[PDB]
Design a protein around this ligand. Structure first.
Ligand SMILES: C[S@@+](CC[C@H](N)C(=O)[O-])C[C@H]1O[C@@H](n2cnc3c(N)ncnc32)[C@H](O)[C@@H]1O
Ligand SMILES: C[S@@+](CC[C@H](N)C(=O)[O-])C[C@H]1O[C@@H](n2cnc3c(N)ncnc32)[C@H](O)[C@@H]1O
Ligand SMILES: N[C@@H](Cc1c[nH]c2ccccc12)C(=O)O
Ligand SMILES: N[C@@H](Cc1c[nH]c2ccccc12)C(=O)O
Lengths: 319, 319
């Protein structure tokens, strides 16, 4: 049935997870065909029961069946690499923490005390909780690192980075975006601001233990705020963009990079942001209103298309 | 993307759950259009955040948008009734117990000690665990009751129940199948065998605390075994069908009713049975092999089509 298989959408995600989180997917490297009997003999996985999983994976378009054997489909080759963006996504998407956060979502919709479904389940807000959970931080930081590495080429092409001298990435995670830009744009001072208990070390990168709710450091002519604002309310978004204006002179520029609400794409991400952060996706026109209210003006607007989502590149300067 | 939204299949199930498990869905009774503002004022649910859920529900085909208002779609009217089969399915499908069972699935595929993913997560096999968990038993028993009520009309039509006098439903749950057949087929002795700590009471129904692994009671000319065999291994399936042969004379008949492996339908159910029970779905030809090995013969075979799954009606008699 249409409705019964919709109610059983969860089974698709769980099947994928069982395949990759075990590391069975890593046996399907370079698009080669795997004999399940030989894999069972090699890995010690149960032939009969794993064969039934492989049949369900073929139905979902993840595996391709031929000569009583299975290979990963062309689009799903990424699952063969455990450090692929898709591999991290599935390990994070379906974990006890996310599931338990989703299970409070219903109850969260009736509370007005600004407590996220995640916080109701786990006792602290997302980032605060990740400070005490290694599994959850590494996989989150690793995921954001991978999506960062993927977008670099498309940024460097559309915008002139050569013009600036002092660049700060605000909430830049492990700093991967700048470390990639530092390789293709040379002889410039690079700084990454994020919440650190222990500073990341790197060759000529300036890692700052900071708080963008309190203040942004002045003395940079380029600022970047990538995939941050969707983790925050409209009010706290204006607070961060205000803290930018206070730190910037008329020469200085801010690159607001973020996933954007395109009507033709799915709202599933918008709901996850509500569950994890009490966040939300926003249209370009909504991002501008927050900037205008904070006293920043839009100089240049570019839409970037990525595998998983469309992005909004917005060049901001003080009014 | 095709792969990223596949990895995020879980979000569809969770969104549905948040809508129904809260009982918000019950405000969409008789296909009427709901004003989210009025619902927020009435129920106390957050307008902004619930409106974003309603937009995602429209995308999934659960809600229909008109005049800045939402009604349940025709196929999803069932969600308005909290005692509908679909409402119970979603409450059971996505719960901590099922999610935690799914999270052991990967690790379960490497163990050979006959421990289900559910058992690895929860410490006992499914039915054994339900003895100590009210939430999980009621919702399970209620779900099986509803699917029982739905199939009655189609059974009574295809098979002559009027010919028999003493009928036993083996593993009949709350007994709902026979209680419905007792209303349309009259003046016959009705017995229901299942695992009971406290016997269900009912007007002229004979509830037996039994164990179909040990033995079936003799002295019945009709036996029914509906939706049981998919919760068990091939070996334990033969044991149950053997226990039938031992209890039956040449006059006696067994109705093996069960969901069947049709190649054109999804394998998601087959994987859930592996996770919950170390069970599996089987083709008619596979069900016959288990019966033939147990020393039973097929007299009459009927395929029944139901909303959620195709069924296999198999009339068995001793060889
Ligand atoms: C959605 S992630 C984006 C990371 C990075 N832009 C990327 O895409 O690789 C948001 C980041 O903001 C950081 N963050 C959260 N609260 C912060 C705060 N108050 N001050 C500074 N950084 C914060 C988190 O640690 C996280 O690395
Ligand atoms: C999948 S449910 C089917 C219930 C019922 N046929 C229906 O569809 O409404 C299987 C039933 O078998 C029962 N059961 C499990 N193990 C049993 C055993 N050893 N002896 C008897 N009944 C058992 C369970 O309690 C459960 O009610
Ligand atoms: N990164 C995934 C979704 C996701 C999972 N966990 C997250 C945490 C933060 C932001 C996004 C996510 C996507 O692109 O769809
Ligand atoms: N009854 C649901 C699936 C389901 C959920 N929990 C179960 C327990 C036992 C058997 C089936 C189920 C269906 O028809 O798809």
């Amino acid at each position: 049935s249409m409705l019964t298989e919709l109610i059983a959408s969860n089974r698709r995600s769980a099947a994928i997870h069982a395949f990759v989180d075990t590391g069975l997917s890593t046996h399907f490297k370079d698009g080669i065909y795997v004999d399940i009997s030989e894999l069972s003999r090699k890995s010690g996985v149960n032939y009969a029961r794993f064969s039934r999983l492989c049949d369900f994976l073929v139905e979902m378009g993840v595996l391709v069946s031929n000569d009583n054997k299975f290979r990963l489909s062309d689009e799903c080759h990424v699952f063969a690499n455990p450090e692929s963006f898709e591999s991290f996504m599935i390990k994070l998407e379906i974990c006890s923490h996310y599931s338990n956060a989703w299970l409070m979502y219903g109850k969260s919709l009736f509370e007005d005390d600004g407590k996220s479904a995640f916080e109701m389940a786990h006792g602290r807000p997302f980032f605060e909780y990740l400070d005490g959970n290694k599994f959850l931080k590494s996989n989150f930081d690793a995921l954001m690192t991978r999506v960062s590495n993927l977008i670099v080429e498309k940024l460097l092409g559309i915008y002139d980075f050569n013009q600036h001298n002092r660049i700060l990435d605000v909430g830049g995670g492990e700093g991967e975006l700048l470390v990639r830009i530092s390789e293709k744009v040379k002889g410039k001072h690079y700084a990454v601001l994020d919440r650190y208990s222990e500073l990341p070390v790197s060759d000529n990168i300036d890692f700052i233990n900071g708080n963008f709710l309190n203040s942004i450091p002045s003395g940079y002519d380029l600022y970047i705020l990538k995939n941050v604002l969707h983790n925050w309310s409209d009010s706290d978004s204006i607070l961060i963009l205000e803290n930018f204006r206070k730190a910037m002179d008329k020469n200085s520029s801010l690159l607001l990079i973020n996933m954007v609400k395109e009507p033709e794409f799915s709202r599933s991400f918008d709901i996850l942001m509500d569950v994890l952060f009490l966040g939300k996706e926003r249209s370009f026109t909504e991002f501008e209103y927050l900037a205008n209210q904070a006293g920043l003006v839009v100089q240049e607007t570019k839409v970037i298309d990525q595998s998983y989502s469309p992005y909004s590149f917005i060049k901001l300067q003080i009014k």
